[PDB]
């Protein structure tokens, strides 16, 4: 029998999610998981994901399961895949050229996007340079266009590195918020544990 099902409800169902820039980083360790029901549920708009195949994913287990969740506009859900570049893709969260986990996404139009506008989700749109894979960016300091450091006088040209989504209930299907998670699988030299039903 299974000793403990890998906890997924707190992050899939959940009650709240952080913004994409301050994106959460959940770790999962010795356990037994039921990704199969994840395939079974039809509520996932885009379950399609890379690396290991879903049907045999339950037979080659790992040491670390790194689950990272966030929400974005629907249209740039394509911006989560190896090799591609884009505003959310490049300035917030990018993936290595190789990848041993994969992604899931679905719709939350009725949950999120309050009628008057949630306005409680921020994303980076400026930065000095490109972004390393799997690095958190909590830096809440001013960014400059150039030739002028405004020295914390935030305002003119100081370009606050956080612009709001500005959701509305009737913007359109291309802008309605989508909930995205990614499960990266890491095989360290330590013994592998995260494999379940057998």
């Amino acid at each position, epitope marked *: 029998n299974i000793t403990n099902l890998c906890p997924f409800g707190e992050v899939f169902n959940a009650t709240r999610f952080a913004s994409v820039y301050a994106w959460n980083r959940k770790r999962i360790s010795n356990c037994v998981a039921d990704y199969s029901v994840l395939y079974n549920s039809a509520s996932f708009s885009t379950f399609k994901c890379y690396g290991v195949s879903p049907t045999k994913l339950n037979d080659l287990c790992f040491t670390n399961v790194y689950a990272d969740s966030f929400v974005i506009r629907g249209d740039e859900v394509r911006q989560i895949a190896p090799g591609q570049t884009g505003k959310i893709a490049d300035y917030n969260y990018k993936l290595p050229d190789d990848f041993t986990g994969c992604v899931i996404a679905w719709n939350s139009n009725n949950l999120d996007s309050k009628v008057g506008g949630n306005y409680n989700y921020l994303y980076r*749109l*400026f930065r000095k340079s490109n972004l390393k894979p799997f690095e958190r960016d909590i830096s809440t300091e001013i960014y400059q*266009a*150039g030739s002028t450091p405004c020295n914390g006088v935030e*305002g*003119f040209n*100081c370009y606050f590195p956080l612009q709001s989504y*500005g959701f509305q209930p009737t913007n359109g299907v291309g802008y309605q918020p989508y909930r995205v998670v990614v499960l990266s699988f890491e095989l360290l030299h330590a013994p592998a544990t995260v494999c379940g039903p057998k």
Partner: antibody, heavy 122, light 106 residues
């Protein structure tokens, strides 16, 4: 992306005047607004440009302090109060939007211009 | 800050190799801008940072320069390019233009 202006025309020197410029077709919360002047049959010249969140502002040296600005965030527009009129101010006036992208992405970049209003002081 | 252009004006024909230079009094870097205005309507953005060509614009345009000297270059001149082209300074907040260069037919 369209712009509309009002408040110009023929006025006598020594009075006070007001100019409004509104726009639509984008998200007005960004794209620091600007004003430019052009005297007829001669080189145009920039006037003003302020900020995103009504932050620190700047003006041309020739007319600094004499005129003032206001960012109408609500009805996505901008007010420009003209004080101490001079006959030199007679020109075509443009209210101009700004971009957000590029290499350096400078707010002083100008694009999506409107139409302009004739202003005469005599 | 004083900005100059050369030539002040010119008259050309279709498909010509056009070239206009712009000089700044002090080193501004590259943030200089290139604008056009055709007779009758609203001017639009053409070149920003002296190295970026605007979207939805023919690739025949070209821009270059640095320091204080910059230059627009036209491989094949076209009938729609006979307009007034001007420089723009993107340096310390007081900003001015150049004298411009109207493009005339020859």
């Amino acid at each position: 992306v369209q712009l509309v202006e009002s408040g110009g025309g023929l006025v006598q020197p020594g009075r006070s005047l007001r100019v409004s410029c509104a726009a639509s077709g984008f998200t007005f919360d960004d794209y620091a607004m600007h004003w430019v002047r052009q005297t007829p049959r001669k080189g145009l010249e920039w006037v003003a440009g302020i900020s995103r969140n009504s932050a620190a502002i700047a003006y041309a040296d020739s007319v600094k302090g004499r005129f003032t600005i206001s960012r109408d965030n609500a009805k996505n527009s901008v007010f420009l109060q003209m004080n101490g009129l001079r006959a030199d101010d007679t020109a075509l006036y443009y209210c101009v939007k700004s971009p957000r992208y590029g290499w350096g992405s400078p707010d002083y970049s100008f694009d999506f211009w409107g139409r302009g209003t004739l202003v005469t002081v005599s | 800050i004083q900005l100059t252009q050369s030539p002040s004006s010119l008259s050309a024909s279709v498909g010509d190799r056009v070239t206009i230079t712009c000089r700044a009094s002090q080193n501004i870097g590259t943030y200089l801008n290139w604008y056009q205005q055709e007779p009758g309507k609203a001017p639009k953005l053409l070149i920003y940072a002296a190295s970026s060509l605007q979207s939805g614009v023919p690739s025949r345009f070209s821009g270059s320069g640095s320091g204080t000297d910059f230059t627009l270059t036209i491989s094949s001149l076209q009938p729609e390019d006979f307009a007034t082209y001007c420089c723009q300074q993107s340096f310390t907040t007081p900003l001015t233009f150049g004298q411009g260069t109207k493009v005339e037919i020859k």
